[PDB]
Amino acid sequence: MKIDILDKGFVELVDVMGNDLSAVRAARVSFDEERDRHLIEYLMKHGHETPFEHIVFTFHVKAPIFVARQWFRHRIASYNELSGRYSKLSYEFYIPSPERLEGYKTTIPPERVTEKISEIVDKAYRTYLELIESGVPREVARIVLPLNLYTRFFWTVNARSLMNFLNLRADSHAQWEIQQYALAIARIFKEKCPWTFEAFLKYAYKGDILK
Amino acid sequence: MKIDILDKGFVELVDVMGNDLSAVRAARVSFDEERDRHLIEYLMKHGHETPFEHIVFTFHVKAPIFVARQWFRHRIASYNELSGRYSKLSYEFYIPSPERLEGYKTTIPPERVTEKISEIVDKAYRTYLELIESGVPREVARIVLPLNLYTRFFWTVNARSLMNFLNLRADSHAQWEIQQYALAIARIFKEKCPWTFEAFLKYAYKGDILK
Amino acid sequence: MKIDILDKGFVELVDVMGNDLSAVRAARVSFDEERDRHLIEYLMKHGHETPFEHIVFTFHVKAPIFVARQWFRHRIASYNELSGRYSKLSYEFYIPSPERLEGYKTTIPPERVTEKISEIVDKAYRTYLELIESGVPREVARIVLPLNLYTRFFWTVNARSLMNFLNLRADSHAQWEIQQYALAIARIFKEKCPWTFEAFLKYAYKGDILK
Amino acid sequence: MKIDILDKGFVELVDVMGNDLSAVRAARVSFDEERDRHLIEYLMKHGHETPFEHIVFTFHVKAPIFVARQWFRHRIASYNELSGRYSKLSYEFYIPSPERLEGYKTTIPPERVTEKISEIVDKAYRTYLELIESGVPREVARIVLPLNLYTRFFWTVNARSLMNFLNLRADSHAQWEIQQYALAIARIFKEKCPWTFEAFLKYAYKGDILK
Numbered sequence: 112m113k114i115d116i117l118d119k120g121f122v123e124l125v126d127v128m129g130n131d132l133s134a135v136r137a138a139r140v141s142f143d144e145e146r147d148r149h150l151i152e153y154l155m156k157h158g159h160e161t162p163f164e165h166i167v168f169t170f171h172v173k174a175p176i177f178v179a180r181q182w183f184r185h186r187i188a189s190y191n192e193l194s195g196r197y198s199k200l201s202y203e204f205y206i207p208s209p210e211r212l213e214g215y216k217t218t219i220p221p222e223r224v225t226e227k228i229s230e231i232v233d234k235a236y237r238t239y240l241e242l243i244e245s246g247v248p249r250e251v252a253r254i255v256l257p258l259n260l261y262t263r264f265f266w267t268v269n270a271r272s273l274m275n276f277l278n279l280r281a282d283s284h285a286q287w288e289i290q291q292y293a294l295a296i297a298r299i300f301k302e303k304c305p306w307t308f309e310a311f312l313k314y315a316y317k318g319d320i321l322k
Numbered sequence: 323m324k325i326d327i328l329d330k331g332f333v334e335l336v337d338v339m340g341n342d343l344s345a346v347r348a349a350r351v352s353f354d355e356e357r358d359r360h361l362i363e364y365l366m367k368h369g370h371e372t373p374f375e376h377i378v379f380t381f382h383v384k385a386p387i388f389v390a391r392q393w394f395r396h397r398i399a400s401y402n403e404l405s406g407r408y409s410k411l412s413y414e415f416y417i418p419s420p421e422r423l424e425g426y427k428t429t430i431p432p433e434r435v436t437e438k439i440s441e442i443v444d445k446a447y448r449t450y451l452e453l454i455e456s457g458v459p460r461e462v463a464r465i466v467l468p469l470n471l472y473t474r475f476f477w478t479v480n481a482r483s484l485m486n487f488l489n490l491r492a493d494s495h496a497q498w499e500i501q502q503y504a505l506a507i508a509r510i511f512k513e514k515c516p517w518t519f520e521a522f523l524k525y526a527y528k529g530d531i532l533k
Numbered sequence: 534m535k536i537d538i539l540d541k542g543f544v545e546l547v548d549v550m551g552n553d554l555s556a557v558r559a560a561r562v563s564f565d566e567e568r569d570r571h572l573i574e575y576l577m578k579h580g581h582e583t584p585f586e587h588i589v590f591t592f593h594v595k596a597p598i599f600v601a602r603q604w605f606r607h608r609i610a611s612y613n614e615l616s617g618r619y620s621k622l623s624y625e626f627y628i629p630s631p632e633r634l635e636g637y638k639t640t641i642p643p644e645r646v647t648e649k650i651s652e653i654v655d656k657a658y659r660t661y662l663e664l665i666e667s668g669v670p671r672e673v674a675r676i677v678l679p680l681n682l683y684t685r686f687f688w689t690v691n692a693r694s695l696m697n698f699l700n701l702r703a704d705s706h707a708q709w710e711i712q713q714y715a716l717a718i719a720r721i722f723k724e725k726c727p728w729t730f731e732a733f734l735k736y737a738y739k740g741d742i743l744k
Numbered sequence: 745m746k747i748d749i750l751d752k753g754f755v756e757l758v759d760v761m762g763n764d765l766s767a768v769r770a771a772r773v774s775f776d777e778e779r780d781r782h783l784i785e786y787l788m789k790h791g792h793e794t795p796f797e798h799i800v801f802t803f804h805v806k807a808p809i810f811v812a813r814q815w816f817r818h819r820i821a822s823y824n825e826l827s828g829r830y831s832k833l834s835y836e837f838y839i840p841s842p843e844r845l846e847g848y849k850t851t852i853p854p855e856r857v858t859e860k861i862s863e864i865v866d867k868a869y870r871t872y873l874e875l876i877e878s879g880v881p882r883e884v885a886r887i888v889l890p891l892n893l894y895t896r897f898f899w900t901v902n903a904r905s906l907m908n909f910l911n912l913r914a915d916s917h918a919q920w921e922i923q924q925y926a927l928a929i930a931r932i933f934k935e936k937c938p939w940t941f942e943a944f945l946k947y948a949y950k951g952d953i954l955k
C-alpha cells in the first residue's frame with residue numbers, strides 16, 4: 112500500500128507484524144470471530160490499550176522537513192531519516208497549491224504566493240549547490256535550505272502509539288499538511304486491522320476528521 | 323520455535339517482523355549480501371543501534387513470578403500477563419533441581435532443600451484454594467502464593483531492546499534462572515537474524531555467557 | 534510528607550522538581566496568577582499534556598509485592614527496589630483487615646481468613662530462614678515467600694505519567710490495595726501542584742474515586 | 745548557570761532535582777562520603793545505571809533548527825519548543841564563523857561563504873515577512889525559512905539519558921555545532937553532580953572530547 116501525499120510526498124507500508132487477533136491473543140495470553148471482535152470493542156471502550164502494542168507497522172514516508180519535525184515529536188516509535196551531513200540533498204520542495212490559502216483573504220493573489228515560495232527555494236538550493244561545489248562541507252552547506260525541503264524516513268510504530276498519533280494528527284488542530292499524512296496512515300491501519308480501527312473510531316478516537 | 327526452560331517453563335516465538343535486511347534498509351532509507359553484512363557489522367561496531375529497532379519479536383513465556391519480576395524491569399518493551407485478580411491460578415511451581423545448589427556447602431542435603439520447597443508451596447496452594455472455595459475474592463486469596471508460582475505472558479520487543487536484555491540477562495551476574503530464559507531468547511534471535519546476532523556477539527555484546 | 538498505607542506500608546515524598554509554574558514556563562518557553570492558572574486549565578482541557586512532564590517527583594514506597602507488581606507496569610518512570618538476591622528479607626507481610634472482605638459472603642468467618650493468611654506466611658518465612666541458615670543462597674531461598682511480603686522502592690515519575698497512574702490506579706477497577714497507595718500519591722500531588730491537580734480533576738481525570 | 749553557544753545561542757540550567765546522593769540513596773533504598781563516592785564509581789564501572797535516573801535537569805536552550813533536529817532525536821526526555829504555527833518567528837540565524845571551515849580547502853574565500861549564507865537568510869526572512877504581511881497564515885509562511893533559524897526549547901532529562909546524550913553528542917562524530925552545546929551541558933552536569941560526572945568520564949563515557 113502506497114499513497115501519494117501533497118505535491119511530491121508519500122506514505123508506504125513496508126512491513127507489519129500481527130493483526131486484530133494479535134491483540135486478542137496477547138490479551139488472553141493464548142496458547143470465535145463474534146467473541147474476538149467483542150473483546151476488541153471491550154478493550155477499546157474500557158481503555159485497556161496495552162494489547163494493541165503487539166501489532167507493529169513499518170512505514171516509509173517522504174515529507175517536508177516542517178512536517179517531519181512535528182511527526183518526530185512522537186517518541187514512542189522508531190525513526191531512521193536521510194542525512195544532510197552524509198548525502199547531497201535533492202532539489203525537491205513542497206510548494207503549496209493555491210487552494211491551500213482558501214479561507215484567507217490575502218493582499219497578494221494566491222498564485223503569486225505560490226511563485227514567491229518557488230523563487231526563494233530555488234535561490235536557496237542554488238546557494239546550497241554553490242557552497243557544496245566550492246568545497247564547503249555538506250553538513251554546513253545544507254543550513255541555508257528551507258523547511259519545505261523534502262526528506263524521507265522509516266517509521267516503526269505499534270498500534271497503540273499509532274492511535275495516539277491519529278488522535279493528535281488526524282484532527283483539525285494539527286497543521287493541514289500533517290493531517291494529510293495522518294489520513295493516509297489511518298487508511299493503512301484500517302486495512303490491516305479493521306476490527307481495531309472500527310473499535311478505535313467508535314470508542315476511543317479523540318480527533319474530529321476520521322469518520 | 324519453542325524451548326523448554328526450567329522444570330515447567332518455556333519460551334516460544336509467536337511472531338516476528340523483519341530480518342537482517344530490515345535494519346540495512348531502515349538504515350539506508352531504501353526504496354549485495356557482502357555489502358549488507360558489512361553494513362550490519364559497521365553499525366554494530368560503531369554504536370549505530372537505531373536501525374535494529376525495525377526488527378520486532380513477540381514471545382510467549384511461561385516463567386516463575388520471581389523471574390518475571392526481573393524481566394518486566396525492561397521497560398522498552400510490551401507485556402501482557404495472566405492475572406490473579408481475573409483467574410484461578412494453576413498449581414504449577416518452580417522446584418529447583420538438586421544441581422541448582424552445586425558449589426554451595428549446605429547443612430541439609432540438597433534433596434531435602436528440594437522437598438522443603440515442595441512442602442511449603444503445597445501448603446500455600448492448599449490455603450489459596452481453601453480461601454477461594456470459602457468465597458474470598460481471588461485477588462486477595464492469591465496473596466499467600468509464593469514467588470516460584472508459574473505465570474505466563476506475551477512480550478513484544480525490538481532487536482535493540484532485546485540486545486540490551488541479552489547484555490544484562492545472558493550474563494553470569496544475572497540470576498541463573500533468568501539466564502536460562504535469556505539463552506533461549508538468544509537462540510531464537512540468532513535463528514531469525516543471523517548477521518545481526520553474529521555482529522552483536524563480535525562487537526557489542528557485554529555479557530559473559532554467549533559465545 | 535509521609536502517609537501510612539495498609540497495615541505496615543507507606544508513601545513518602547523524597548524530592549520534587551518544579552511546581553505549577555514549571556508547566557506554564559515550559560509551555561511558554563519563558564525567559565499574572567490569574568492568567569497562569571487559566572493557561573493550566575487550558576492545557577488540561579485541550580489535551581496539551583507535555584508541559585506537565587517538566588514537574589518531577591521522587592517517592593519512597595513500602596508496599597507488598599503484589600501491589601509493586603502492578604505499580605511497576607508503569608514504564609514511563611524510574612524504579613529502584615530492595616533485592617532478595619542481595620539482602621536477607623524482613624519478616625513483614627500484609628495481612629488484610631477483616632473489613633477487607635466486607636460485601637462478600639464467606640463460608641468461613643473473616644477473622645479466620647485473617648488467621649489462615651498469618652499462619653501460612655509464618656510457615657513460609659520459617660522455611661525461608663531454615664534454608665538461609667542451612668547455606669542455601671538467598672536468591673533461591675526467597676522463592677518460597679508469598680506475594681504479600683513487603684518490599685520498598687524509590688519511584689521517580691513526572692506529573693504527566695503520574696496523571697496516567699492516577700487515572701488507572703485511583704479508580705474502582707484497580708485492586709483496593711493499590712487504590713490506597715494512589716490516594717496517597719494524589720494527596721501529595723495536590724499539595725505540591727494545586728493548580729495542575731484541580732485542573733486535572735476538572736478536565737482530564739478518568740477515574741471514579743478522586744473528587 | 746548560563747553559557748553562550750555559537751553566535752547567538754545559549755544553554756541555561758532552569759532547575760535540577762537531586763544530586764550525587766540521590767543516586768546513592770535510590771540505589772540503597774535509603775531511609776560516609778568515602779563510601780558514597782565509592783558506590784557511585786562501583787555503579788558506573790559495572791553498568792548499574794538506573795540509580796542515576798533519580799537526578800533530573802531542566803534546561804532552556806537557544807539553538808538553530810538543524811541542531812534542534814538532531815537533539816530532539818533523544819526520545820528519553822521531555823521537550824517544549826517555540827512554534828512557528830503559533831508565533832511570528834524572530835530574525836535570528838546562525839552564521840558560521842570563518843574558522844568553521846578550517847581544514848577544508850574551498851574555491852571561494854571563507855569570508856565570502858559567510859556572506860553568501862547571510863545573503864540567502866536575509867532574502868528568505870524578507871519573503872517570510874512579505875507573506876505574513878500579505879495575510880498568509882504563519883504556519884505556511886514559515887516554510888521558506890532556512891534550517892539555521894534559531895529556535896528555543898525547554899528540555900527535561902535525567903542523568904542517565906544525559907550520559908547517553910553526552911556519549912553521542914560530546915564526540916567528534918557528532919556535528920561540531922551540537923558538540924558545542926554538549927560541552928556546555930557537560931559543564932553544568934559536572935557542576936551539579938561532580939562524583940557522578942567524574943565516575944562517568946573514568947568508567948562509562950564513550951566519546952572522545954570530554955577529559
Ligand SMILES: Cc1cc2nc3c(=O)[nH]c(=O)nc-3n(C[C@H](O)[C@H](O)[C@H](O)COP(=O)(O)OP(=O)(O)OC[C@H]3O[C@@H](n4cnc5c(N)ncnc54)[C@H](O)[C@@H]3O)c2cc1C
Binds near residue numbers: 280
Ligand atoms: C495541534 C498540536 C500543537 C502542538 N504545539 C506544540 C508546541 O507549540 N510546542 C511543542 O513543543 N510541541 C507541540 N506539539 C507537540 C506535542 O507537545 C507532542 O510532543 C506531540 O503531540 C506528541 O505527543 P505525545 O507525547 O503524546 O506522543 P509520544 O511522545 O509518542 O508519547 C506517547 C505517549 O507516551 C507517554 N509519554 C512518552 N514519553 C513520556 C514522558 N517522557 N513522560 C510522560 N509521558 C510520556 C504519553 O502518555 C504519551 O501520550 C503540538 C502537537 C499538536 C498535535
Ligand SMILES: Cc1cc2nc3c(=O)[nH]c(=O)nc-3n(C[C@H](O)[C@H](O)[C@H](O)COP(=O)(O)OP(=O)(O)OC[C@H]3O[C@@H](n4cnc5c(N)ncnc54)[C@H](O)[C@@H]3O)c2cc1C
Binds near residue numbers: 610905
Ligand atoms: C544483575 C542485575 C542486578 C539488578 N539488581 C537490581 C536491584 O537490586 N534493584 C533494582 O531495582 N533493580 C535491579 N536490576 C534491574 C535494573 O536496575 C534494570 O531495571 C534492568 O536491568 C533493566 O535494564 P534497563 O533499564 O537497561 O532496560 P529498559 O528499562 O528496557 O531500558 C532500555 C534502555 O532505555 C533507556 N531507558 C529506558 N527508560 C529510561 C528512563 N526512564 N531514563 C533513562 N533511560 C531509560 C536506557 O538506555 C536503557 O538501557 C538489576 C539488573 C541486573 C541485570
Ligand SMILES: Cc1cc2nc3c(=O)[nH]c(=O)nc-3n(C[C@H](O)[C@H](O)[C@H](O)COP(=O)(O)OP(=O)(O)OC[C@H]3O[C@@H](n4cnc5c(N)ncnc54)[C@H](O)[C@@H]3O)c2cc1C
Binds near residue numbers: 269400401610694706
Ligand atoms: C484495572 C487494571 C487491570 C489490569 N489487568 C491487567 C492484566 O490482566 N494483565 C496485564 O498484563 N496487565 C494488566 N493491567 C496493566 C496494564 O496493562 C498496564 O500495564 C498498566 O495499566 C500501565 O499503564 P500504561 O501502559 O498506560 O502506563 P506506562 O507503561 O507508564 O505508559 C504510559 C503511557 O506511555 C505510553 N506507552 C508507554 N510505553 C509504550 C509502548 N511500548 N507502546 C505504546 N505506548 C506506550 C502509553 O500512552 C501509556 O499510556 C491492568 C491495569 C489496570 C489499571
Ligand SMILES: Cc1cc2nc3c(=O)[nH]c(=O)nc-3n(C[C@H](O)[C@H](O)[C@H](O)COP(=O)(O)OP(=O)(O)OC[C@H]3O[C@@H](n4cnc5c(N)ncnc54)[C@H](O)[C@@H]3O)c2cc1C
Binds near residue numbers: 197398486820912917
Ligand atoms: C554521529 C551521529 C550520526 C547520526 N546519523 C543519523 C542518520 O543519518 N539518520 C538518523 O535517522 N539518525 C541519525 N543519528 C541519530 C541516532 O540514530 C539516534 O536517534 C540519536 O543518537 C539518539 O540516540 P538514542 O536512541 O540512543 O537516544 P534516545 O532516543 O534518548 O534513547 C535512549 C536509550 O533508550 C533506548 N531506547 C529509547 N527508545 C527505544 C526504542 N524504541 N527501542 C529500543 N531502545 C530504545 C536505547 O537504549 C537508547 O540508547 C545520528 C546520531 C549521531 C550521534
Ligand SMILES: O=c1ccn([C@H]2C[C@H](O)[C@@H](COP(=O)(O)O)O2)c(=O)[nH]1
Binds near residue numbers: 181182184285828
Ligand atoms: O502542530 C504542531 C506544532 C508544533 N509541534 C512541535 C514540533 C516542533 O518541535 C515544535 C515547533 O513546531 P512548529 O509549530 O514550528 O511546526 O513543536 C508539533 O509537533 N505540532
Ligand SMILES: O=c1ccn([C@H]2C[C@H](O)[C@@H](COP(=O)(O)O)O2)c(=O)[nH]1
Binds near residue numbers: 395619
Ligand atoms: O538480578 C536482578 C535483581 C533485581 N532485579 C529487580 C527486580 C525487582 O524489581 C527488584 C528485586 O528483585 P530480586 O533481587 O528480589 O529478584 O529488582 C532485577 O531485575 N534483576
Ligand SMILES: O=c1ccn([C@H]2C[C@H](O)[C@@H](COP(=O)(O)O)O2)c(=O)[nH]1
Binds near residue numbers: 405606
Ligand atoms: O489490576 C491489575 C491487574 C494486573 N496487573 C498486571 C500486573 C502483573 O504484571 C499482571 C498480573 O497481575 P495480577 O492480576 O496478578 O495482580 O498484570 C496490573 O498492573 N493491575
Ligand SMILES: O=c1ccn([C@H]2C[C@H](O)[C@@H](COP(=O)(O)O)O2)c(=O)[nH]1
Binds near residue numbers: 196810815917
Ligand atoms: O549527527 C546526526 C546526524 C543525523 N541525525 C538525525 C537528525 C535528523 O532526524 C536526521 C537527519 O539529520 P542531518 O544529518 O540532516 O543533520 O538524522 C542526528 O541526530 N545526528
Ligand SMILES: [Cl-]
Binds near residue numbers: 201202
Ligand atoms: Cl535532484
Ligand SMILES: [Cl-]
Binds near residue numbers: 411412413414
Ligand atoms: Cl491446576
Ligand SMILES: [Cl-]
Binds near residue numbers: 622623624625
Ligand atoms: Cl525482621
Ligand SMILES: [Cl-]
Binds near residue numbers: 833834835836
Ligand atoms: Cl526580530
